[PDB]
Design a protein around this ligand. Structure first.
Ligand SMILES: [Ca+2]
Ligand SMILES: [Ca+2]
Length: 332
């Protein structure tokens, strides 16, 4: 006789939340993005990569925007290589890593069918193209959501579920088992570095490499860890929010986290065109201090932008992307 399941479900999914709008000046929908912009990452030179076309006649693709232009226009990056099947390319989280000779690597979570891999590409800037280097999969990478690169083929990955089969995983989620987990992957060594998560989702790292941040979507929490020289993670603190936190970006200059969120779990998980999900963007400053300063920078009911997952800032501008629909480019 335990209504505990119903009340635990109602809080994880935030079932009655209604967005308090927070407005920005000069918001423009990005021309050419209509099939999602689930993750994005901006380089220090202002080039932004965006994954798009995620599925749970328009393919998965990676898009490029040059945010130094006054009206940035998106372009599709061509994938070259014969080691990747691009017909099933279905991109999700992404990360970059810039090596010492200045080579830019792009890592992309890919879901061909219901499996996960991480695809490593080298960015060829002049040609506007991604050279495929390699496809990574692993038994400890069953259901990958996002990664943060710490080398050309080294990364921490979140897995949003423990199970791969879609029936199993959807039950796994509804029951609140919280068996999802985080994996450190390298050529030499692959191991679980944290576990027990209710829907681990965004992940990122501080600019000095000392701290890893992990979003726990359905617990509405961001976990902060100290990252050791040997890649171990030790819990340092946990932030709680009243919203479902999706992808984390890090401002390289200050270290602030910028977070894409879903106010209402029902509207994002149980989709319908008559009642679309809204959007919400959080800024988090001084995440190690006694009180982190948390600010809603943008929030709206979804009549302009539906289902924000990610946001990042570049030179006074905010770029926001979503799981399945548009993207928004605003003044701060
Ligand atoms: Ca990412
Ligand atoms: Ca995500």
């Amino acid at each position: 006789l335990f209504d505990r399941q119903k009340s635990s479900f109602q809080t994880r999914f935030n079932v009655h939340r209604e967005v308090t709008p927070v407005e920005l000046p000069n918001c423009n929908l990005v021309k050419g993005i209509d099939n999602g912009s689930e993750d994005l990452e901006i380089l220090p030179n202002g080039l932004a990569f965006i994954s798009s076309g995620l599925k749970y006649d328009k393919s998965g693709k990676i898009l490029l925007m040059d945010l130094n232009e006054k009206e940035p226009a998106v372009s599709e990056l061509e994938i070259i290589g014969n080691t990747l099947d691009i017909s099933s390319f279905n991109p999700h989280g992404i990360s970059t890593f810039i090596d010492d000779d200045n080579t830019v690597y792009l890592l992309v979570v890919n879901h061909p069918g219901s499996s996960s891999t991480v695809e490593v590409f080298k960015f060829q800037e002049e040609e506007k193209s991604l050279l495929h280097l390699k496809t990574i999969r692993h038994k400890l990478l069953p259901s990958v959501n996002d990664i943060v690169a710490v080398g050309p083929e080294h990364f921490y990955a979140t897995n949003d579920h423990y199970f791969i089969d879609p029936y199993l995983k959807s039950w796994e989620m509804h029951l609140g088992l919280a068996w999802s987990f985080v994996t450190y992957y390298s050529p030499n060594d692959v191991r679980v570095v944290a576990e027990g998560f209710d829907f681990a989702n965004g992940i990122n790292i501080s600019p000095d490499g000392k701290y890893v941040y992990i979003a726990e979507l359905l617990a509405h929490k961001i976990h902060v860890y100290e990252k050791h020289a040997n890649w171990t993670l030790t819990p340092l603190r946990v932030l709680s929010f009243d919203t479902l936190v999706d992808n984390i970006s890090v401002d390289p200059v200050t270290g602030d986290l910028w977070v894409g969120c879903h106010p209402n779990g029902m509207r994002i998980f149980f989709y319908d065109a008559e009642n679309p999900p809204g959007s919400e963007v959080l800024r988090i400053q001084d995440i190690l201090s006694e009180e982190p300063k948390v600010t809603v920078v943008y929030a709206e009911n979804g009549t302009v932008l539906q289902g924000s997952t990610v946001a990042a800032v570049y030179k006074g501008k905010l770029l926001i992307g979503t799981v399945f629909h548009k993207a928004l480019y605003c003044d701060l």
